[PDB]
Design a protein around this ligand. Structure first.
Ligand SMILES: [Cl-]
Ligand SMILES: [Fe+3]
Length: 186
């Protein structure tokens, strides 16, 4: 029985219930993420920015079932085109707007990766992706507003692939945390 998360802490408690088992009801998870109304005071601890690129700030380890993290995007900061390592990936905006561009998996032949679509994700909206859907790039294209998003990945993963838009060629990337549980982790 899905109830509205009253706070980020409450959201986390609900997520632990939704991930108690071995499978994932994606629509329920997305619905509860969407229902949490971003409250900046509740996540200020995790919202640690870097001047040069977006940061990943671990919030909860989901009793091993998922990683929940907050990503902080300076003006003009964005990601690679990337996959999600056979995991579910949820993205909820907590502040600002992000542009999500979708791409299909490349063929073996070297070719320009053509965007299949794009959307603007707005405050409190939740998006979902997995490798069966395709690849994406996420970007804060704003010149004036930093963005903050809440990401849930299940199972957790710390490696993924970045794709070269010019060729479709992929490279393995290890993902790093800027902080964990509010503590900067050089
Ligand atoms: Cl993502
Ligand atoms: Fe992603």
């Amino acid at each position: 029985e899905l109830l509205k998360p009253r706070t980020l802490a409450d959201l986390i408690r609900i997520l632990h219930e939704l991930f108690a088992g071995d499978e994932v009801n994606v629509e329920e998870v997305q619905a509860v993420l969407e229902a949490y109304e971003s409250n900046p005071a509740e996540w200020a601890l995790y919202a640690k920015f870097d001047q040069y690129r977006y940061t990943r700030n671990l919030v909860d380890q989901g009793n091993g079932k998922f990683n929940l993290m907050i990503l902080c995007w300076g003006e003009g900061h964005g990601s690679s085109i990337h996959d999600h390592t056979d995991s579910h990936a949820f993205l909820k905006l907590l502040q600002g707007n992000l542009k999500e561009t979708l791409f299909d998996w490349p063929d073996k032949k070297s070719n320009e990766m053509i965007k299949k679509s794009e959307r603007t994700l707005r405050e409190n909206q939740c998006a979902y992706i997995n490798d069966s859907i395709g690849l994406h790039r996420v970007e804060n294209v704003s010149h004036t507003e930093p963005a903050v998003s809440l990401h849930l990945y299940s199972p957790p993963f710390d490696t993924c692939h970045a794709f070269d838009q010019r060729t479709g060629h992929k490279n393995k990337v290890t993902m790093t945390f800027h902080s964990k549980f509010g503590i900067r982790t050089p």
